[PDB]
């Protein structure tokens, strides 16, 4: 275990004897993480890195049916709860009874707007975040019933209603614009095969403007580089086949710099704290960058590993991000939620599975029962679900109007 090595103690923060809110909060975190790493030593047992599948499963299968009122704050993100859960069950290799699947379908049908796209719950105006989640969930289910839920003609119509002259998209009518909308739109449009010749005109150029001096991408041009926005920007470009619109090298340096030398997990932006959900948003960028550089015929790329420490990330997730009661989390001391369960699991899968053309190479830390189902780095649903969905929607012609 890389984290438990003696020389690893050398990776602790060095504040130069100049304390600020930043160095103080980081130190608090490193302190709490160290107690976790050393827990084995102090209790004299052999470290057994085990992914509590059964614990995660009861939590998941239960949240899929009902939730306490603590979730009232996510009452406008219900299609997200469906995606987060079904996708977590999918990574864990747990099946969706055909009865559960049809129920989820019927629910998303209620969330779908007569104007296209899905709202955060039955009767809510459509928004791109829950539209992306609703579409991804239906693709994980992959039945003809699920696929048929989506009104492709109203969907394309909705996307056009959000499209802006500068290339960006609003998140919803009368709403805000940021890189998330570009990804949400490129994701649902590509999966459903509704991309017209001009739908994304100028979009690649607008996303390119979000890349700043740090190498990463901000929510809108001018903003600080962040992992959630950077994944959205790059993943959208990959879908549009415009990855080259970005300085891929400065981005590679930025994302690789986001992995915490000590904790092993990824921070969202420079000088902030590590967080389990970034095991996906940030680490998810490495597979995307591998593909892009490889497309450019990069000869120096690895043939077995992603350009981040797959071992350290898996150790941070397995040792620090699991709630004993089931569910995963941001960091030790945080409460579990379905969002972090989904992304901690998504990031673990990315960390375990390498692949570039004919090469395949796994790295499963802890017990081998830890290995999860692979996840497509662009859509974050099973690669099989992507192929199955796109192949299906390709039988339909692009809506003409």
């Amino acid at each position: 275990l890389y984290s438990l090595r003696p020389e690893h103690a050398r990776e602790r923060l060095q504040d130069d004897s100049v304390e600020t809110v930043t160095s103080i909060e980081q130190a608090k975190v490193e302190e709490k993480i160290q107690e976790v790493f050393s827990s084995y030593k102090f209790n004299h047992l052999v470290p057994r890195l085990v992914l509590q599948r059964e614990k995660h499963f009861h939590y998941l299968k239960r949240g899929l049916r009902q939730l306490t009122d603590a979730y009232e704050c996510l009452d406008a993100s219900r299609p997200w709860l469906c995606y987060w859960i079904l996708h977590s069950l999918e990574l864990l290799d747990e099946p969706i009874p055909q009865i559960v699947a049809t129920d989820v379908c019927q629910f998303l049908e209620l969330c779908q707007s007569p104007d296209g796209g899905f709202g955060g719950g039955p009767g809510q105006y459509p928004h791109l975040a829950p539209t992306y989640a609703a579409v991804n969930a239906l693709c994980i289910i992959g039945t003809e019933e699920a696929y048929n839920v989506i009104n492709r003609e109203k969907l394309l119509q909705y996307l056009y209603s959000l499209k802006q002259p500068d290339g960006s998209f609003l998140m919803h009518v009368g709403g805000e614009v940021d890189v998330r909308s570009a990804y949400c739109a490129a994701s649902v449009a590509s999966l459903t095969n509704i991309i017209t010749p001009d739908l994304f005109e100028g979009t690649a150029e607008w996303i390119a403007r979000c890349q700043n001096w740090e190498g990463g991408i901000g929510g809108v041009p001018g903003m600080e580089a962040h992992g959630g926005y950077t994944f959205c920007g790059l993943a959208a470009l990959v879908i549009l086949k415009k990855e080259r619109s970005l300085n891929l090298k400065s981005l590679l340096q930025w994302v690789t710099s986001r992995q915490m030398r000590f904790e092993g997990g990824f921070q969202g932006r420079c000088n902030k704290l590590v967080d389990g959900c970034y095991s996906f948003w940030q680490a998810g960028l490495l597979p995307l960058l591998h593909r892009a550089l490889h497309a450019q015929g990069d000869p120096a790329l690895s043939m077995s590993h992603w350009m981040f420490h797959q071992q350290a990330l898996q150790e941070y997730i397995l040792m620090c991000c699991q709630c004993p009661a089931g569910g995963l989390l941001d960091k030790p001391g945080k409460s579990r939620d379905f969002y972090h369960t989904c992304y901690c699991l998504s990031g673990l899968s990315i960390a375990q599975h390498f692949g570039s053309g004919a090469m395949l190479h796994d790295v499963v830390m802890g017990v081998p029962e830890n290995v999860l189902q692979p996840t497509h780095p662009v859509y974050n649903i099973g690669p099989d679900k992507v192929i199955q969905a796109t192949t299906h929607f390709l039988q339909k012609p692009v809506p003409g109007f």
Binding site: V21, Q66, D69, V104, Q106, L110, G123, M223
Partner: protein
């Protein structure tokens, strides 16, 4: 008559006489609900009533006051926010009193997309940015890195052209925490949108300033990323004195950031046909292994990639 959602004498809408005429519309979750939230009595009450007035598009003062309660129960409900803006224009509400409202709610929950977007809509309508820099500064005093706060700030400044005192505010926050990457980002936003970095005096002032910060806190990555960011533009090799000046901190201020910056300067020297191609390359490759095996092992895969890549390129 704003009966607070938190007031000890708050009564459910179904127990309110001035609402006894309207029937609450319950949520249609389907016969076999999924990810079904067990709402509290209050939440359920307010929303069943919100659905009712929305479904009938009742643009009343009573509907307006109710959206405030529905917003307070779930500030992320964008449908409610939309209808609230609908009623703000219908009832012709005093938008300044609404600015007072949004100021409070943002203070309560500053990490919410809806509240900041709403504030921006109000500022646009009133074409009045006069309270902005000060309001935002109060939020940044509570969380100096709030993403929405910095985003709103960039919007007000660019939209209304309020550039004049921002670099000073940046210097202020940098004194408070020289590691606040949001402030380093703001520094670049201001400079690139005012003077720019082609003005040699500015560039000099910026590189000198940054180097002083590096000297003070050598392990502060933000100052390093900013240094790289403002020179990387024209090409690090374009600055012959820099390598030397950094090589000097090799014993005193030598974090793995100094090491990584040297490899960056070398990478650009090679691509830019430098003297001693064989030599320079060996130094760069040497540093990549020191980094991969010793100084920055978390990024070993990256540094090996850099090593291999440099070889293929400049053998």
């Amino acid at each position: 008559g704003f009966l607070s959602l938190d007031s000890p004498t708050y009564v459910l809408y179904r127990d309110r006489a001035e609402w006894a005429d309207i029937d609450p519309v319950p949520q249609n979750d389907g016969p076999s609900p999924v990810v079904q939230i067990i709402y509290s009595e209050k939440f359920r009450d307010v929303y069943d009533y919100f659905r009712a007035v929305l479904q009938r598009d009742e643009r009343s003062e009573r509907a307006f006051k109710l959206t405030r309660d529905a917003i307070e129960l779930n500030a992320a409900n964008y449908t409610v926010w939309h209808f609230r803006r609908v009623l703000l224009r219908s009832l012709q509400k005093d938008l300044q009193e609404e600015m007072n409202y949004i100021t409070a709610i943002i203070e309560e929950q500053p990490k919410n997309y809806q509240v900041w977007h709403h504030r921006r809509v109000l500022v646009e309508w009133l074409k009045d940015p006069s309270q902005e820099l000060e309001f935002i500064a109060d939020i940044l005093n509570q969380d100096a890195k709030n993403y929405h706060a910095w985003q709103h700030r960039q919007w007000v400044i660019q939209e209304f052209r309020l550039w004049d005192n921002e670099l000073q505010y940046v210097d202020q926050l940098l004194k408070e925490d020289v590691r606040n990457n949001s402030v380093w980002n703001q520094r670049h936003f201001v400079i690139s949108n005012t003077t720019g970095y082609s003005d040699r005096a500015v560039l000099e002032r910026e590189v000198q300033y940054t180097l002083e910060m590096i000297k003070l806190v050598p392990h502060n990555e933000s100052a390093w990323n900013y240094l790289k960011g403002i020179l990387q533009d024209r090409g690090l090799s374009r600055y012959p004195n820099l390598l030397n000046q950094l090589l000097d901190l090799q014993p005193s201020h030598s974090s793995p950031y100094l090491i990584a910056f040297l490899v960056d300067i070398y990478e650009d020297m090679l691509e830019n046909q430098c003297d001693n191609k064989e030599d320079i390359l060996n130094k760069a490759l040497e540093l990549c292994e020191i980094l991969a095996k010793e100084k920055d092992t978390i990024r070993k895969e990256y540094w090996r990639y850099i090593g291999r890549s440099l070889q293929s390129k400049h053998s």
